Coordinates of all heavy atoms in Angstrom, one line a residue:
Chain B
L1803 N -28.1 0.4 18.0 CA -28.6 -0.3 19.2 C -29.7 -1.3 19.0 O -29.8 -2.4 19.5 CB -28.9 0.6 20.3 CG -27.7 1.3 21.1 CD1 -28.1 2.6 21.8 CD2 -27.2 0.2 22.0
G1804 N -30.7 -0.8 18.2 CA -31.9 -1.6 17.9 C -31.6 -2.9 17.1 O -32.5 -3.7 17.0
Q1805 N -30.4 -3.1 16.6 CA -30.1 -4.3 15.8 C -29.4 -5.4 16.6 O -29.2 -6.5 16.1 CB -29.4 -3.9 14.5 CG -30.2 -2.9 13.6 CD -29.3 -2.3 12.6 OE1 -28.1 -2.0 12.8 NE2 -29.9 -2.1 11.4
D1806 N -28.9 -5.1 17.8 CA -28.3 -6.1 18.7 C -29.5 -7.1 19.0 O -30.7 -6.7 18.8 CB -27.8 -5.5 20.0 CG -26.7 -6.3 20.7 OD1 -26.5 -7.5 20.4 OD2 -26.0 -5.8 21.5
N1807 N -29.2 -8.3 19.5 CA -30.3 -9.2 19.8 C -30.9 -8.7 21.2 O -30.4 -7.8 21.8 CB -29.8 -10.7 20.0 CG -28.8 -10.9 21.1 OD1 -28.6 -10.1 22.0 ND2 -28.1 -12.0 21.0
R1808 N -32.0 -9.3 21.5 CA -32.7 -8.8 22.7 C -31.9 -8.8 24.0 O -32.0 -7.9 24.8 CB -34.0 -9.7 23.0 CG -35.2 -9.2 22.3 CD -35.9 -8.1 23.2 NE -35.0 -7.5 24.1 CZ -35.3 -6.8 25.2 NH1 -36.6 -6.6 25.5 NH2 -34.4 -6.3 26.0
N1809 N -30.9 -9.7 24.1 CA -30.1 -9.7 25.3 C -28.9 -8.8 25.2 O -28.2 -8.6 26.2 CB -29.5 -11.1 25.5 CG -30.5 -12.1 26.1 OD1 -31.2 -11.7 27.1 ND2 -30.6 -13.3 25.6
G1810 N -28.7 -8.1 24.1 CA -27.7 -7.1 24.0 C -26.3 -7.8 23.9 O -25.3 -7.2 24.4
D1811 N -26.2 -8.9 23.3 CA -25.0 -9.7 23.2 C -23.8 -9.0 22.5 O -22.6 -9.2 23.0 CB -25.2 -11.1 22.6 CG -26.0 -12.0 23.6 OD1 -25.9 -11.8 24.9 OD2 -26.6 -13.0 23.2
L1812 N -24.0 -8.4 21.4 CA -22.9 -7.7 20.7 C -22.3 -6.6 21.6 O -21.1 -6.5 21.7 CB -23.3 -7.2 19.3 CG -23.9 -8.2 18.4 CD1 -24.2 -7.6 17.0 CD2 -22.9 -9.4 18.1
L1813 N -23.2 -5.8 22.2 CA -22.7 -4.7 23.1 C -21.9 -5.3 24.3 O -20.9 -4.8 24.7 CB -23.9 -3.9 23.6 CG -23.6 -2.8 24.7 CD1 -22.4 -1.9 24.3 CD2 -24.8 -2.0 25.0
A1814 N -22.5 -6.4 24.8 CA -21.9 -7.1 26.0 C -20.5 -7.6 25.6 O -19.6 -7.6 26.4 CB -22.7 -8.2 26.5
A1815 N -20.3 -8.1 24.4 CA -19.1 -8.6 23.9 C -18.0 -7.5 23.8 O -16.9 -7.7 24.3 CB -19.2 -9.3 22.6
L1816 N -18.4 -6.4 23.2 CA -17.5 -5.3 23.1 C -17.0 -4.9 24.5 O -15.8 -4.7 24.7 CB -18.1 -4.2 22.3 CG -18.4 -4.4 20.8 CD1 -19.3 -3.4 20.2 CD2 -17.0 -4.5 20.1
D1817 N -18.0 -4.7 25.4 CA -17.6 -4.3 26.7 C -16.7 -5.3 27.4 O -15.7 -4.9 28.0 CB -18.9 -4.2 27.6 CG -18.5 -3.9 29.1 OD1 -18.0 -2.9 29.4 OD2 -18.8 -4.8 29.9
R1818 N -17.0 -6.6 27.2 CA -16.2 -7.6 27.8 C -14.8 -7.6 27.3 O -13.8 -7.7 28.0 CB -16.8 -9.0 27.5 CG -15.9 -10.2 27.7 CD -16.7 -11.6 27.8 NE -17.6 -11.7 26.7 CZ -19.0 -11.5 26.7 NH1 -19.5 -11.1 27.8 NH2 -19.7 -11.7 25.6
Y1819 N -14.6 -7.5 25.9 CA -13.3 -7.5 25.3 C -12.4 -6.4 25.8 O -11.1 -6.5 25.9 CB -13.4 -7.4 23.8 CG -14.2 -8.6 23.3 CD1 -14.8 -8.5 22.1 CD2 -14.3 -9.7 24.1 CE1 -15.6 -9.6 21.6 CE2 -15.1 -10.9 23.6 CZ -15.7 -10.7 22.3 OH -16.5 -11.8 21.8
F1820 N -13.0 -5.2 26.1 CA -12.2 -4.1 26.7 C -12.0 -4.1 28.1 O -11.0 -3.7 28.6 CB -12.9 -2.8 26.3 CG -12.9 -2.5 24.8 CD1 -14.0 -1.9 24.2 CD2 -11.8 -2.7 24.0 CE1 -14.0 -1.6 22.8 CE2 -11.8 -2.5 22.6 CZ -12.9 -1.9 22.1
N1821 N -13.0 -4.5 28.9 CA -12.9 -4.4 30.3 C -13.0 -5.6 31.3 O -12.7 -5.5 32.4 CB -14.0 -3.4 30.8 CG -14.0 -2.1 29.9 OD1 -13.0 -1.4 29.9 ND2 -15.1 -1.9 29.3
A1822 N -13.5 -6.8 30.8 CA -13.6 -7.9 31.7 C -12.3 -8.5 32.2 O -11.3 -8.7 31.4 CB -14.4 -9.0 31.0
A1823 N -12.2 -8.7 33.5 CA -11.0 -9.3 34.1 C -10.8 -10.7 33.7 O -9.7 -11.2 33.5 CB -11.0 -9.2 35.6
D1824 N -11.9 -11.4 33.3 CA -11.9 -12.7 32.9 C -11.8 -13.1 31.4 O -12.0 -14.2 31.0 CB -13.0 -13.6 33.6 CG -14.4 -13.1 33.3 OD1 -14.5 -12.2 32.4 OD2 -15.3 -13.5 34.0
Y1825 N -11.6 -12.0 30.6 CA -11.4 -12.2 29.2 C -9.9 -11.9 28.9 O -9.4 -10.9 29.3 CB -12.2 -11.2 28.4 CG -12.0 -11.3 26.9 CD1 -12.4 -12.4 26.2 CD2 -11.3 -10.3 26.3 CE1 -12.2 -12.5 24.8 CE2 -11.0 -10.4 24.9 CZ -11.5 -11.5 24.2 OH -11.2 -11.6 22.8
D1826 N -9.3 -12.9 28.2 CA -7.9 -12.7 27.9 C -7.6 -13.0 26.5 O -7.6 -14.2 26.0 CB -7.1 -13.7 28.9 CG -5.7 -13.9 28.4 OD1 -5.1 -13.0 27.7 OD2 -5.1 -14.9 28.8
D1827 N -7.3 -11.9 25.7 CA -7.0 -12.1 24.3 C -5.5 -12.0 24.0 O -5.1 -11.8 22.9 CB -7.8 -11.0 23.4 CG -7.4 -9.6 23.8 OD1 -6.4 -9.4 24.5 OD2 -8.1 -8.7 23.3
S1828 N -4.7 -12.1 25.0 CA -3.3 -12.0 24.8 C -2.7 -13.0 23.8 O -1.8 -12.7 23.1 CB -2.5 -12.3 26.2 OG -2.6 -13.6 26.7
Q1829 N -3.4 -14.2 23.6 CA -2.9 -15.1 22.6 C -3.8 -15.2 21.4 O -3.7 -16.0 20.5 CB -2.9 -16.5 23.2 CG -2.1 -16.6 24.5 CD -0.6 -16.2 24.4 OE1 0.0 -15.5 25.2 NE2 0.0 -16.6 23.3
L1830 N -4.7 -14.2 21.2 CA -5.6 -14.2 20.0 C -4.7 -13.9 18.8 O -4.1 -12.9 18.7 CB -6.7 -13.1 20.1 CG -7.7 -13.1 18.9 CD1 -8.5 -14.4 19.0 CD2 -8.6 -11.9 19.0
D1831 N -4.7 -14.8 17.8 CA -3.9 -14.7 16.6 C -4.6 -13.8 15.6 O -5.7 -14.2 15.0 CB -3.7 -16.1 15.9 CG -2.5 -16.0 15.0 OD1 -2.7 -15.3 14.0 OD2 -1.5 -16.6 15.2
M1832 N -4.0 -12.7 15.3 CA -4.6 -11.7 14.4 C -4.5 -12.1 12.9 O -5.0 -11.4 12.0 CB -3.9 -10.3 14.6 CG -4.2 -9.8 16.0 SD -6.0 -9.5 16.3 CE -6.2 -8.0 15.3
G1833 N -3.9 -13.3 12.6 CA -3.9 -13.8 11.2 C -2.9 -13.2 10.2 O -2.1 -12.3 10.6
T1834 N -3.1 -13.6 9.0 CA -2.2 -13.2 7.9 C -2.8 -12.4 6.8 O -2.3 -12.3 5.7 CB -1.4 -14.4 7.4 OG1 -2.3 -15.4 6.9 CG2 -0.4 -14.9 8.4
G1835 N -4.0 -11.9 7.1 CA -4.7 -11.1 6.1 C -3.9 -9.9 5.7 O -3.0 -9.5 6.5
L1836 N -4.1 -9.3 4.6 CA -3.4 -8.2 4.2 C -3.6 -6.9 5.0 O -4.7 -6.3 5.2 CB -3.7 -7.9 2.7 CG -3.6 -9.1 1.8 CD1 -4.1 -8.7 0.4 CD2 -2.1 -9.6 1.8
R1837 N -2.4 -6.4 5.5 CA -2.3 -5.1 6.2 C -2.1 -3.9 5.3 O -1.4 -4.1 4.3 CB -1.1 -5.1 7.2 CG -1.4 -5.6 8.6 CD -1.9 -7.0 8.6 NE -2.1 -7.5 10.0 CZ -2.4 -8.7 10.4 NH1 -2.6 -9.7 9.4 NH2 -2.5 -9.0 11.7
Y1838 N -2.7 -2.8 5.6 CA -2.5 -1.6 4.7 C -1.1 -1.1 5.1 O -0.9 -0.8 6.3 CB -3.5 -0.5 5.1 CG -3.4 0.7 4.1 CD1 -4.2 0.7 2.9 CD2 -2.7 1.8 4.5 CE1 -4.1 1.7 2.0 CE2 -2.6 2.9 3.6 CZ -3.3 2.8 2.4 OH -3.3 3.9 1.5
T1839 N -0.2 -1.0 4.1 CA 1.1 -0.5 4.5 C 1.6 0.8 3.9 O 2.8 1.0 3.7 CB 2.2 -1.6 4.1 OG1 2.0 -2.1 2.7 CG2 2.1 -2.8 5.1
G1840 N 0.7 1.7 3.5 CA 1.2 3.0 2.9 C 1.9 3.8 3.9 O 1.7 3.6 5.2
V1841 N 2.8 4.6 3.5 CA 3.6 5.5 4.4 C 3.6 6.9 3.7 O 4.0 7.1 2.6 CB 5.0 5.1 4.7 CG1 5.6 4.5 3.4 CG2 5.9 6.2 5.2
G1842 N 3.2 7.9 4.5 CA 3.1 9.3 4.0 C 4.2 10.1 4.6 O 4.7 9.8 5.7
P1843 N 4.6 11.3 4.0 CA 5.6 12.2 4.4 C 5.2 12.6 5.9 O 6.1 13.3 6.6 CB 5.5 13.4 3.5 CG 5.1 12.7 2.2 CD 4.0 11.7 2.6
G1844 N 4.1 12.3 6.3 CA 3.6 12.6 7.7 C 3.6 11.4 8.7 O 3.2 11.5 9.8
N1845 N 4.2 10.2 8.3 CA 4.3 9.1 9.2 C 5.6 8.3 8.8 O 5.6 7.1 8.8 CB 3.0 8.2 9.2 CG 2.9 7.3 7.9 OD1 2.9 7.9 6.7 ND2 2.8 6.0 8.0
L1846 N 6.6 9.1 8.5 CA 7.9 8.5 8.1 C 8.6 7.8 9.3 O 8.6 8.4 10.4 CB 8.8 9.5 7.4 CG 8.1 10.3 6.3 CD1 9.0 11.5 6.1 CD2 8.1 9.4 5.1
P1847 N 9.3 6.7 9.0 CA 10.0 6.0 10.1 C 11.3 6.8 10.4 O 11.8 7.6 9.6 CB 10.3 4.7 9.6 CG 10.6 5.0 8.1 CD 9.5 6.0 7.8
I1848 N 11.9 6.5 11.6 CA 13.1 7.1 12.0 C 14.2 6.4 11.2 O 14.1 5.2 10.9 CB 13.4 6.8 13.5 CG1 12.5 7.6 14.4 CG2 14.9 7.3 13.9 CD1 12.6 9.1 14.3
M1849 N 15.1 7.2 10.6 CA 16.1 6.6 9.8 C 17.4 7.3 10.1 O 17.4 8.3 10.8 CB 15.8 6.8 8.2 CG 14.6 5.9 7.7 SD 14.4 6.0 6.0 CE 15.8 5.0 5.4
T1850 N 18.5 6.7 9.7 CA 19.8 7.3 10.0 C 20.7 7.3 8.7 O 20.8 6.3 8.0 CB 20.5 6.4 11.0 OG1 19.8 6.4 12.3 CG2 21.9 6.9 11.3
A1851 N 21.3 8.5 8.4 CA 22.1 8.6 7.2 C 23.1 9.7 7.4 O 22.9 10.7 8.2 CB 21.2 8.8 6.0
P1852 N 24.3 9.7 6.7 CA 25.2 10.7 6.7 C 24.6 12.1 6.3 O 23.7 12.1 5.5 CB 26.3 10.3 5.7 CG 26.2 8.8 5.7 CD 24.7 8.6 5.8
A1853 N 25.1 13.2 6.9 CA 24.6 14.5 6.6 C 24.9 14.9 5.2 O 26.0 14.4 4.6 CB 25.1 15.6 7.6

Side-chain angles (χ1 to χ4, degrees):
Chain B
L1803 286 160
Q1805 302 166 322
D1806 201 340
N1807 60 19
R1808 269 278 21 200
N1809 282 316
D1811 286 337
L1812 303 182
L1813 170 54
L1816 290 169
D1817 172 66
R1818 167 166 48 262
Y1819 303 158
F1820 294 138
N1821 310 301
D1824 56 14
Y1825 173 73
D1826 166 24
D1827 62 11
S1828 65
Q1829 311 297 140
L1830 184 68
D1831 196 298
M1832 296 297 286
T1834 55
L1836 311 173
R1837 267 61 175 186
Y1838 187 85
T1839 51
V1841 39
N1845 73 306
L1846 307 163
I1848 288 298
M1849 289 185 75
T1850 297

